[PDB]
Design a protein around this ligand. Structure first.
Ligand code: CLA
Ligand code: CLA
Ligand code: CLA
Ligand code: CLA
Ligand code: CLA
Ligand code: CLA
Ligand code: CLA
Ligand code: CLA
Ligand SMILES: CC1=C(/C=C/C(C)=C/C=C/C(C)=C/C=C/C=C(C)/C=C/C=C(C)/C=C/C2=C(C)CCCC2(C)C)C(C)(C)CCC1
Ligand SMILES: CC1=C(/C=C/C(C)=C/C=C/C(C)=C/C=C/C=C(C)/C=C/C=C(C)/C=C/C2=C(C)CCCC2(C)C)C(C)(C)CCC1
Ligand code: SF4
Ligand code: SF4
Ligand SMILES: [Ca+2]
Ligand SMILES: [Ca+2]
Lengths: 66, 42, 139, 74, 66, 80, 45, 74, 156, 74, 222, 31, 156
């Protein structure tokens, strides 16, 4: 909140218009909000970028047994 | 534009061939293709 | 034929369907010296009577899953029939009166191969022939 | 062939865009395969139809999502 | 059976208390609970510092207040 | 309508007959065992195909097979 | 009626028909019984 | 000409007594390939999935068609 | 109380307040699919007319033509023509293919149409039923501005 | 983990020096193995008894131009 | 006890819905069909290759017909780098106005598809320059697909079915597939390149009424 | 210069020749 | 080859590729006049609808009213009413007058409607058939400007 009273949200009213198509969940939620875990190398969020990619391993690894 | 036109020759021909082979003819075709699948032998 | 009183069962949903009226239907028949309660193969629980019992089942695996239950109630006298819709009651279990676990005489070696299992012929021996490789009249 | 044609595409998408030093420095670890190839190049694809419009990739943005449905239903 | 159930709950409750004494000990010795209680807006909540080996001290990001 | 063949490696332990849920197998007399028995399958039209007789055979590379063939209404277990 | 209405909206948005899909601007599906409980729990203070 | 049935069973190499082609027993392989329609089909798909990789590995490096190098998507 | 289905505890149904009520038994057995003493054409003519009448509904107000008025009622009628041609296609296809030696079992209720002359007569009913109803609800929708007036006294 | 933990210089980078030798044995003069069609004083470049490599000066203009996909930089 | 599938009688008496699906994925396995000998085996392999070659020649005649009719091969051939090819046209009757406009690309007056197959670059190289040589090549492949549907019908008639000794003639098939199928038809393609595709890449137009007079070389035929 | 209006109708009747001959083959292979 | 008609060389027909093919026998014996297992109303309802649909054709584009648009489709419908009233008049007149002791011969194919209760049911089919088809092709022709738009995407 600023010094007038209006609120600028984190994604900005994005759920009302774009969460009704599941291309909007792909583009506006999974692609657009993972710019903090993709570009999290060389920084202090570096372990979250490794657990993100170590997570995708164990899912695809699960499909050997399933 | 706001309409499906055709600059090519015989542009009336997709106007009838696209409803024909996709939603007018297949339910006849799926009827004929069902009458020999479930046809009895004697 | 068949006769007996049905057990006290309050109706179910896993019972007979339109197959039992049109194709075939099975009937197990036992007698009980007690008013005991057993588990139905069609889901639930029923109280068998003290006389001749009679229960209509839909397929033969339901009768012998029930027949394997009565043998734990020390009831080993059950007869399983198979009722075609024209009324023809054949009698199928136990066929000779004796249970198929213990041996009786006069019974035949039916579907028996006189070889080891590992010396069945190759499927290229029986190519473009009517027989399969496990029929194989040589040995 | 999702490793052959992922490497044909990214080696050539770095030559055609001139950025040959993008593949040559970030294909040696699996984050750059995920950040610079999959996440980066799907920007112009999933925007085949935004809430504000629709371009000529609106059928490739739909087939891309028809193919996630056919994969998941498998 | 029920004596095995009752005695295994006690060994489970003695496992929660190990973990609950690890959350209060990490807030005691390895945290900025002093700096966070003074300013709960600018200082970020942090426990669980990381050892200086294998170059993983890049995960020790700045939490406000040194 | 499956095909339950029985080979001469049998030992007459009657374990396949007790494991059959549909009474396909039965014990007939024989000469090549100490029990003097061998299994036979006269009610192979009642073969439900479930291969539970095959898990009970203790002879190595078992003496009974179920060859899953042309399945019918009583060889598929349909109560409807 | 929950997922294939996300595939109806996904096809109308790609077709360039944003007035035909289940939006707040197109075919509105309002939570009538859940917008009413938000009205009750602020009129009972 | 050559008889393929003779090339399988030939056990004489200028007076020597080799077991066949490359001193390896290839006898009975003529009537194994010729009667099997799956031996002939597997050899024809292995030799067509090499010519289909070789199509792909060569047509991007040595393009045979006019201005197909400057059409990046085809 | 819930007793077994018509006194048979071995049958796979229950004699429940929904299927064996006095009310819901006298409502289901008086619907035209089950009403006693009807020719199969009059069964299908009443089943069809109740279906052509409502099936033009969901396309003239939320269809692709809802923004106009004269073209909205065409796209709702054209829908119910195609729903009821392809459904009355599927029951001529049903009776050709299920009556070949197994007339729904020669050996029974909830399906009292077991003859193939009782089904070819039914298919003629549902066709002329579901397109009299599709036109009656089309003539009551393209003439809605003239029917709002006679149901409000605006025609004096 | 090395790029994630800051030290991108601690990556194990094996230079593929056996397939960089193939390009340098066909005409790619970028690496500098300087042998066998990268060395113009060789037996394979000149073909000393006949000198009938009429294909060769047109080929080396293709492999050493950096605008085609013929034997890309490895 | 149904008629379908007619090739296997152990599946026609299936009482379930497994009969439909297992008759799809067994219908081409001719070696397991009921009542088939080895001579009747090969004569249905042979006559279904004919019905498969006709699918290839009718598919290649749908590439040519749809860029002669709906493509821009006359427009693309004048600036083949700065214009996109056209596969065919769109007739999806549920487009909105935002998808008629978005798909009206590459200088078309209708919605179209940009061809990513590369057949425009193939026909520019081998010497096709107008939309009529594409059309009469599409009408020829229709008729070429008709002589392969007729040949497949021919070799099931009992006076024309080959015997098992002809199918197992492996040395005579290798002679004609190397010399005739791979040798002559690669000799013939060097005939098209020398006569048509090389002179049409140099400006002069060589067609069917032109190729018998103008030789492809000034030192020609000698 | 695209093809004429008649050349489309000429192609539709020429392709009835492999449309009918495809029926002679599909039934001589005994569906 | 052309063999005699069903093995009888004395009968006056030939077993020719047109009447005794596999194809043209399975097409003619599956037309609604010859399809097995149809009530005679459903025979006539399908025969009629295929005829009312096309008979409005040759009068709305080359008739006397072709210069207008709204009056063209009336003169094409009015034609197919009069063609199909006077044809379904002529087959009630046919069955009254040919079923009096000679039911197309009591003693046979190509005319399987030999009962007079199988012909009075047929006449009810061709009437309601050839005027459902005459209206469906009338409602698709007076609404043609609204059907050119929905088959070209002009309605968004
Ligand atoms: C010269 C005579 C001749 C010719 C032209 C053919 C032609 C053909 N035959 Mg036949 N055949 C012949 C004689 C001939 N045959 C004889 C005498 C016999 C008696 C034994 C047979 C027995 C026979 C049988 C049983 C069958 C055929 C079949 C075929 C067809 C193959 C299908 C196809 O698309 O091929 C391929 C088409 C190409 C254009 C080849 C290009 C693709 C290849 C893979 C790449 C070539 C590149 C090369 C190999 C690369 C390496 C070169 C090397 C120097 C490095 C083809 C049209 C099949 C058929 O009926 O189809 C209808 C089949 O079932 N033939
Ligand atoms: C992420 C997904 C994934 C991964 C990593 C693997 C990995 C592997 N598969 Mg595969 N597989 C998968 C998905 C996957 N699969 C799916 C979806 C299918 C289809 C059903 C298959 C079906 C399949 C078959 C049929 C076979 C394999 C085989 C193998 C092994 C290959 C040999 C090797 O050493 O490689 C690398 C080794 C590893 C990646 C192991 C990881 C080392 C761990 C992390 C050590 C640390 C442990 C510690 C607790 C942390 C390997 C373990 C083959 C095999 O077993 O060879 C004998 C084999 O034949 N897989
Ligand atoms: C097999 C190649 C092939 C393919 C993939 C297509 C594909 C297409 N055509 Mg077609 N067409 C072809 C050959 C082909 N065509 C030939 C040779 C002709 C000349 C007669 C035509 C004449 C034609 C016209 C007039 C039109 C199309 C149209 C179309 C489009 C929609 C389909 C449709 O409604 O029309 C129906 C298709 C036909 C009337 C003829 C197709 C039948 C061909 C001859 C053979 C295909 C059968 C195939 C071999 C079956 C095997 C596959 C099976 C085993 C699964 C579609 C992209 C429409 C369009 O332009 O869209 C905008 C359009 O109206 N085509
Ligand atoms: C939930 C249970 C739990 C977990 C996951 C941890 C986890 C950890 N502890 Mg801890 N600890 C615990 C309970 C726990 N502790 C309890 C109950 C006590 C009191 C005895 C301690 C007292 C303790 C000390 C003194 C230290 C750790 C340290 C550590 C870290 C490294 C230890 C190692 O190398 O192995 C690690 C993050 C070390 C650390 O944080 O390094 C800076 C360290 O110095 N722990
Ligand atoms: C190279 C392999 C490797 C090795 C040998 C270690 C070893 C260690 N790590 Mg570590 N780590 C690694 C990779 C590795 N890490 C990677 C790739 C990540 C990012 C996901 C981490 C993120 C990490 C964190 C956040 C912590 C450790 C900690 C530790 C220490 C105790 C672990 C424990 O309690 O159990 C231990 C010396 C703990 C520690 O430092 O104790 C105070 C701890 O806090 N690691
Ligand atoms: C049968 C499946 C089904 C299920 C599991 C739900 C479940 C839910 N609905 Mg719902 N709904 C349904 C059918 C269903 N609905 C139908 C057929 C309609 C059209 C009449 C609606 C119209 C509807 C509205 C307007 C709302 C919900 C809402 C909700 C949520 C709150 C619970 C509630 O009581 O609302 C009401 C439940 C009904 C009206 C039941 C409908 C009649 C059934 C068949 C009896 C909940 C998750 C509310 C919500 O939270 O939105 C976010 C909301 O306001 N529904
Ligand atoms: C309800 C969803 C839906 C349906 C039923 C269709 C149906 C059709 N589309 Mg289509 N399409 C859709 C969504 C849909 N589309 C969406 C969301 C887009 C992106 C805007 C497209 C873009 C598209 C293109 C580019 C084409 C089609 C074409 C076609 C026709 C070809 C049939 C086929 O390929 O399979 C068919 C009439 C093709 C065509 O017109 O055939 C000639 C054509 O090339 N569509
Ligand atoms: C099988 C492929 C093939 C076929 C059918 C032909 C056919 C022909 N060639 Mg050709 N040619 C071919 C391959 C082929 N050639 C190849 C591979 C080369 C390169 C060496 C040539 C180089 C060539 C020359 C230089 C000439 C011909 C000429 C001719 C024509 C002979 C003139 C005549 O009236 O009789 C004739 C139509 C002569 C001609 O005058 O064309 C009209 C002529 O001068 N050809
Ligand atoms: C369950 C129930 C319910 C419901 C019901 C419903 C669901 C409804 C409905 C309804 C409906 C849905 C109705 C309808 C109808 C109809 C009608 C009334 C019709 C008609 C018609 C006509 C009259 C036609 C005519 C014609 C013809 C014949 C042809 C020519 C043309 C014309 C058009 C003239 C309730 C809860 C309420 C209660 C009770 C029970
Ligand atoms: C020989 C042949 C041929 C031809 C065919 C033809 C001749 C055609 C046609 C056609 C036609 C001619 C068709 C039609 C149709 C129709 C329809 C589709 C109908 C309808 C209808 C309806 C739906 C109605 C309705 C209604 C009613 C009932 C009443 C009320 C009103 C209304 C209107 C609603 C060819 C060569 C091609 C091929 C094959 C063989
Ligand atoms: S099959 Fe098993 S149970 Fe039967 S005789 Fe052999 S070993 Fe005994
Ligand atoms: S398949 Fe089942 S029913 Fe048949 S013999 Fe084996 S265990 Fe018994
Ligand atoms: Ca709309
Ligand atoms: Ca006039």
């Amino acid at each position: 909140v600023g010094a007038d009273g209006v609120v600028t949200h984190i994604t900005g009213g994005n759920f009302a218009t774009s969460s009704i198509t599941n291309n909007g969940w792909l583009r506006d939620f999974l692609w657009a909000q993972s710019t903090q875990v993709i570009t999290s190398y060389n920084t202090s969020l570096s372990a979250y970028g490794l657990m993100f990619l170590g997570g995708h391993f164990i899912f695809g690894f699960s499909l050997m047994f399933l | 534009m706001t309409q499906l036109t055709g600059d090519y020759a015989a542009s009336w021909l997709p106007w009838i061939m696209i409803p024909l082979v996709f939603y007018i003819l297949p339910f006849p075709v799926f009827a004929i293709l069902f009458l020999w699948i479930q046809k009895e032998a004697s | 034929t068949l006769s007996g009183q049905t057990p006290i069962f309050g109706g179910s949903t896993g019972g007979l369907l339109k197959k039992a009226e049109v194709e075939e239907k099975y009937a197990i028949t036992w007698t009980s010296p007690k008013e005991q309660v057993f588990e139905m193969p069609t889901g639930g629980a029923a109280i068998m009577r003290q006389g001749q019992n009679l229960l209509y089942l839909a397929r033969k695996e339901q009768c012998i899953a029930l027949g394997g239950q009565l043998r734990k109630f020390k009831i080993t006298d059950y007869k399983i029939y198979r009722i075609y819709p024209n009324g023809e009651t054949v009698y199928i279990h136990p066929a000779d009166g004796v249970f198929p676990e213990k041996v009786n005489q006069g019974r035949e070696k039916v579907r028996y191969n006189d070889r080891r299992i590992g010396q069945n012929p190759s499927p290229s021996k029986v190519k473009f022939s009517g027989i399969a490789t496990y029929d194989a009249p040589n040995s | 062939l999702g490793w052959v044609t992922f490497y044909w595409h990214w080696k050539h998408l770095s030559i055609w865009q001139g950025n040959v030093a993008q593949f040559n420095e970030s294909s040696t670890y699996l984050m750059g395969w995920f950040r610079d190839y999959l996440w980066a190049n799907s920007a112009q694809l999933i925007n085949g139809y935004n809430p504000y419009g629709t371009n000529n990739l609106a059928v490739w943005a739909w087939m891309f999502l028809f193919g996630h449905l056919a994969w998941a239903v498998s | 059976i029920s004596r095995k159930i009752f005695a295994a709950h006690f060994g489970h409750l003695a496992v929660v208390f190990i973990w609950l004494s690890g959350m209060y000990f990490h807030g005691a010795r390895f945290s900025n609970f002093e700096a966070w209680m003074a300013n709960p807006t600018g200082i970020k909540p942090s426990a669980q510092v990381v050892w200086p080996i294998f170059g993983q001290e890049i995960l020790n990001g700045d939490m406000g207040g040194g | 309508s499956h095909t339950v063949k029985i080979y001469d490696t049998c030992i007459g332990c009657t374990q396949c007959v007790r494991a059959c849920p549909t009474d396909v197998l039965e014990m007939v007399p024989w000469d090549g065992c100490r029990a003097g028995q061998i299994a036979s399958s006269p009610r192979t039209e009642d073969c439900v195909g479930c291969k539970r007789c095959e898990t009970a055979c203790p002879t190595d590379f078992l003496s009974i097979r179920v060859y899953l063939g042309a399945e019918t209404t009583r060889s598929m277990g349909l109560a409807y | 009626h929950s997922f294939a209405m996300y595939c109806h909206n996904d096809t109308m948005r790609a077709f360039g028909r944003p007035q035909d899909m289940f939006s707040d601007t197109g075919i509105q599906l309002q939570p009538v019984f859940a917008q009413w409980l938000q009205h009750i729990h602020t009129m009972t203070i | 000409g050559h008889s393929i049935k003779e090339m399988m069973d030939s056990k004489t190499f200028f007076g020597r007594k080799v077991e066949g082609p490359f001193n390896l027993p290839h006898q009975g392989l003529y009537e194994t390939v010729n009667n099997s329609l799956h031996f002939q089909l597997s050899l024809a798909l292995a030799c067509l999935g090499v010519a289909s990789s070789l199509t792909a590995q060569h047509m991007y490096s040595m393009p045979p068609y006019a201005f197909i190098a400057k059409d990046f998507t085809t | 109380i819930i007793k077994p289905f018509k006194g048979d505890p071995c049958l796979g149904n229950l004699s429940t307040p929904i299927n064996d009520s006095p009310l819901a038994k006298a409502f289901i057995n008086n619907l035209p699919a089950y009403r006693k003493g009807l020719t199969p054409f009059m069964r299908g003519l009443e089943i069809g007319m109740a279906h052509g009448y409502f099936l033009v509904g969901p396309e003239v107000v939320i269809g692709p033509l809802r923004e106009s008025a004269h073209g909205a009622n065409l796209s709702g009628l054209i829908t119910a023509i195609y729903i009821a041609v392809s459904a009355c296609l599927g029951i001529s296809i049903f009776a050709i293919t299920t009556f070949q030696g197994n007339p729904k079992g020669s050996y029974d209720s909830l399906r009292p149409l077991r003859t193939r002359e009782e089904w070819s007569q039914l298919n003629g009913g549902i066709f002329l039923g579901a397109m009299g109803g599709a036109i009656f609800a089309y003539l009551l929708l393209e003439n809605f501005d003239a029917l709002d007036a006679i149901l409000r006294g605006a025609v004096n | 983990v090395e790029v994630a933990f800051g030290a991108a210089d601690k990556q194990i980078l094996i230079e593929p020096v056996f397939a960089q030798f193939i390009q340098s044995a066909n005409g790619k003069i970028l690496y500098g193995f300087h042998t066998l069609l990268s060395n113009p004083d060789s037996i394979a470049f000149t073909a000393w008894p006949n000198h009938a490599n009429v294909w060769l000066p047109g080929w080396l203009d293709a492999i050493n131009n950096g605008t085609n996909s013929l034997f890309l930089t490895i | 006890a149904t008629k379908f599938p007619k090739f296997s009688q152990d599946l026609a008496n299936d009482p379930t819905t497994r009969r439909i699906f297992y008759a799809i994925a067994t219908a081409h396995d001719f070696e397991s069909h009921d009542g088939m000998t080895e001579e009747n085996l090969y004569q249905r392999i042979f006559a279904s290759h004919f019905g498969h070659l006709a699918i290839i020649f009718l598919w290649a005649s749908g590439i040519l017909f749809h860029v002669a009719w709906q493509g821009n091969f006359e427009v693309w051939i004048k600036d083949p780098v700065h214009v996109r090819p056209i596969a065919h046209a769109i007739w999806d009757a549920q487009f909105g106005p935002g998808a008629i406009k978005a798909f009206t690309q590459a200088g078309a007056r209708n919605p179209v598809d940009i061809c990513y197959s590369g057949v425009y670059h193939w026909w520019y190289t081998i010497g096709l320059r107008t939309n009529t040589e594409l059309y009469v090549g599409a009408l020829f492949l229709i008729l070429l697909a008709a002589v392969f549907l007729f040949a497949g019908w021919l070799h099931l008639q009992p006076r024309y079915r080959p015997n098992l000794g002809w199918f197992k003639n492996s040395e005579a098939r290798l002679n004609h597939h190397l010399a005739g199928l791979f040798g002559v038809s690669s000799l013939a393609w060097a005939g098209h390149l020398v006569h048509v595709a090389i002179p049409e890449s140099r400006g002069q137009h060589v067609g069917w009424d032109n190729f018998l007079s103008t030789p492809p070389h000034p030192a020609g035929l000698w | 210069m695209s093809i004429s209006d008649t050349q489309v109708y000429i192609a539709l009747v020429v392709a009835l020749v492999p449309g009918f001959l495809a029926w002679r083959l599909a039934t001589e292979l005994y569906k």
